[PDB]
Each structure stands twice: as C-alpha cells, then as structure tokens.
Design a protein around this ligand. Structure first.
Ligand code: GHM
Length: 437
C-alpha cells in the first residue's frame, strides 16, 4: 500500500476483505506511536465511544475536539465531554449561513513524532461498522532538532498548506497545533492538500480553496494528453446539495470545468456520478437505516430531477463492499477504458456548492460556506504519468487502489436515488423492516 490509502473495516464481510483495512482502534494503537496529545476534527461525535477507542494507557492524554456546533447542539457536546477532564473543545466559526464543519482529520502527537490522518468517518460507532469509508495515513513525521533550521517541507507543499488550513480557524487551540507542525519534518509527504474554509475569496486567494484549488493543482501538476476530451470525470458522494435549475447553473459550468483541467494550455467530457439507489440501500448490510447517512432530501431533489440522469449505482465487488453503503467521497479522472487514472481525490466534500464553492460577483469571488478536507494523488508526485487501476482492491504496486467498480453502472429505468425523508414501504430491507421517516 505505497499510497497509504485505506478503507475502514466492515463487519460481516469475509476476512480477505478486511485484511488491509483499518479500524479506529488500529489507528490509535500503540503500534502507531506513543500518544502524547491528539486533535479530532469532525462533524458528529459520541464522546463515550470515542474515548473507548483509544488504548487504555492513552485515554487520559489531552484530546481536542474541533467541531462546528452552535446553540443547543454545542451545549449537548459540552455535556458529553464534561466527564472527561482531559478533553477540550474548539468551536469552528461558521459565519456564513448554512455552513458546516465537515472536515474529518486526526492530528496525533507522539513521543516519536507526528502523524496526520485525513479520513471520511464521523466519530460514532455506526460510521465504522458497516460503511465504505476512506482513510489517508501520513508517514510518521520526525521532529526537527531544536536549533536546527530546515523547512521540513515536501515537494507538494503539504506542510505550509496544512498550516494555512489551520490558520483559517483563527483559534488559540489550533495555533498550538500549528506550532507542533512547525517543529516536525513533513518532507516525505507525497499528496496535495485540498481544503475548503468558509469565506469569500478574490484575487490570489481564489486558488486557495474548493474547486479552484483543485483546478490550480491540475493546471500546475498534471499534463493534458491526446483525446483528453474522452477521459471521463467520476464523482462519488453521500449527499447532494441544491445545484440549480439545470446543469449549466453550476454542475457543468464551473464544477465540471475545474474537474476537467489538465495542464497549462486551453465540453463533451462524460461526467459519471455515483450515488446509492433505493435498491442499493434496501439490500445493504444495514438495510434502510444506512439511508440515515445519505441525507439527500426530497425538497432538494424535486428541484433538480435533471440531475438524476447522471446517477450510477454503488458497486464495489473489487473490495467486497457492494453492500457496505458509501460514506467516503471520491473524485477521479479515468481513461476512456477505465484502465488508468490521471488523478484521485478522497475528501469530506459532497456534491454541493457549500463544500466546493460557487462563483459570485460576476465570476470574481469564490464563496464557500463549509469546512472540508481531502488529499489529492497526482502521478507526477510519484514520478509517473498515470496510475494503473488496481483490479482487486486487496490483491506491480504503482497501481492505485480504487475502492469501487469501473465502469460505473447507470441506474436502471426503475431505479431512484436514495432520498432520506420519504417512506419506502413496497419491499422490506435485509433486517425485515420498511422505512417510515
Ligand atoms: O448533508 C448533510 O446534512 C450532511 C451532514 C453531515 C455529514 C457528515 O457526515 O459530516 C454529511 C455527509 O458527509 O454525508 C452530510
């Protein structure tokens, strides 16, 4: 696994499909480092559960929970953490309406160094039980000797970019973690950071975040190939926001335009969107309750039925996870026969303007509502022109482990996208139940 891209363990699949997977207890194990302190960035927390995932000998080390909760939600989280004297909270500012703190990241400070984990799972039991989730594990970063002056920077600029992401919170508890990062050597990092932070960005700052950040990296660090117009774009997500009355409002005009960038010079590129059908959810390991974590509302969906003609079923025989509903989000650029990919992104970002940004003020300002974070795998960062797609996820080794099946399979005429707040009472799920919200 030279890309250090992992799936979470899934209860109920055969051992061959969990052999190279990671549970949260594995990540926090003493085998990964001797914990001194940690920060848990996330959206939803079960604090009693979370502390039990740390090894007993590490359960009293300081923990910082970075969240976006307000009002009664914030009070509930404080009450959850109150019994644990070692747990501090950091409330991420959300000064733009309808924004969220979605970023999922662990900062793990050890006696031996520092590790960064960027992943897709909430800190609750159900997100690690029977879902398809993604994890990127950084190398163990050694500390820079006191008195030594070196950058500790990687060719992908990951150290400066992670510090920049953290500086946008303007938070004292995160300045402490910025100072920790400054003291470590991150030069071995071979991924690019793609973050979103709330704000309105113009000028140079426009390229710092969201889909303009992706565009800039693809312009600077990928190459266009002949017949590039035939290389599809694939997006794969667990929720969809309001994208507008037709595809030209945002999806195909600025989102797809950023995703199809390759190289510096200057559309019929196919766009495949992967999102679970009702049948995918009904026959899943969890049954209909998996749809609680696929929060596409009827109010949103009924305004954009044009979108569903882009939708393809969830299928993941390659990793034994066709019945483990996706909470991972991924985006990638495969070749016309899906045998190679020009790049791969794993991220918290769903298919929404809130997460990726939407242009404002006559195309001069990028407005983002939410916090998001992911990592981009580019062939150039590995001395390659493209990645070969791995045929079996858990089976050279410059081959990238794409976790679901290619080519994606279009919905059938009877399929419908999972919509969480309407009832399904025609056919029961794998546990014998209907869905009545
Ligand atoms: O659309 C929503 O309301 C929503 C809220 C929270 C999350 C999350 O897990 O952090 C997600 C998701 O990632 O699917 C979606």
């Amino acid at each position: 696994n030279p890309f250090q891209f992992y799936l979470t363990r899934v209860s109920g699949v055969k051992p061959k499909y969990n052999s190279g997977a990671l549970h949260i207890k594995d990540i926090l194990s003493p085998l990964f480092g001797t914990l001194v302190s940690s920060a848990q960035f996330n959206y939803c927390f079960d604090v009693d559960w979370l502390v039990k995932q740390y090894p007993p000998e590490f359960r009293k080390k300081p923990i910082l929970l970075v969240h976006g909760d307000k009002r009664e939600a914030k009070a509930h989280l404080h009450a959850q953490a109150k019994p644990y004297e070692n747990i501090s909270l950091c409330q991420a500012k959300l000064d733009i309406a309808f924004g969220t703190h979605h970023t999922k990241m662990m900062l793990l400070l050890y006696e031996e160094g520092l590790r960064v984990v960027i992943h897709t799972s909430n800190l609750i039991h159900a997100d690690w039980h029977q879902k398809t989730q993604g994890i990127w594990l950084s190398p163990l970063y050694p500390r820079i000797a006191d008195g030594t002056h070196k950058s500790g920077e990687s060719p992908t600029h990951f150290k400066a970019d992670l510090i920049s992401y953290l500086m946008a919170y303007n938070a004292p508890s995160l300045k402490e973690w910025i100072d920790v990062i400054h003291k470590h050597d991150l030069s071995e990092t071979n991924v690019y950071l793609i973050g979103s932070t709330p704000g309105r960005f113009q000028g140079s700052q426009k390229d710092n975040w969201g889909h303009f950040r992706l565009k800039k990296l693809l312009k600077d660090h990928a190459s266009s190939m002949p017949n590039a117009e035939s290389w599809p774009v694939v997006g794969q997500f667990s929720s969809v926001g309001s994208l507008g009355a037709d595809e030209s409002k945002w999806l195909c005009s600025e989102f797809k335009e950023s995703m199809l960038t390759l190289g510096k010079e200057s559309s019929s590129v196919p766009l495949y969107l992967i999102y679970p059908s009702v049948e995918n959810v009904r026959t899943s390991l969890e049954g209909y309750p998996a749809g609680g974590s696929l929060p596409y509302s009827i109010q949103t969906a009924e305004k954009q039925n044009w979108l569903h003609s882009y939708f393809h079923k969830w299928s993941a025989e390659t990793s034994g996870r066709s019945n483990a509903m996706p909470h991972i989000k991924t985006y990638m650029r495969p070749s016309p026969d899906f045998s190679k990919i020009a790049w791969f992104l794993v991220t918290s970002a769903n298919l929404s303007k809130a997460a990726w940004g939407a242009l404002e003020k006559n195309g001069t300002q990028l407005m983002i509502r939410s916090y998001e974070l992911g990592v981009l795998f580019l062939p150039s960062a590995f001395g390659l022109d493209s990645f070969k797609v791995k045929q079996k996820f858990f089976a050279p080794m410059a081959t990238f482990p794409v976790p679901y099946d290619l080519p994606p399979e279009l919905y059938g005429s009877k399929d419908r996208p999972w919509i969480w707040n309407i009832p399904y009472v025609k056919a029961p799920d794998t546990h014998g139940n209907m869905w009545v919200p």
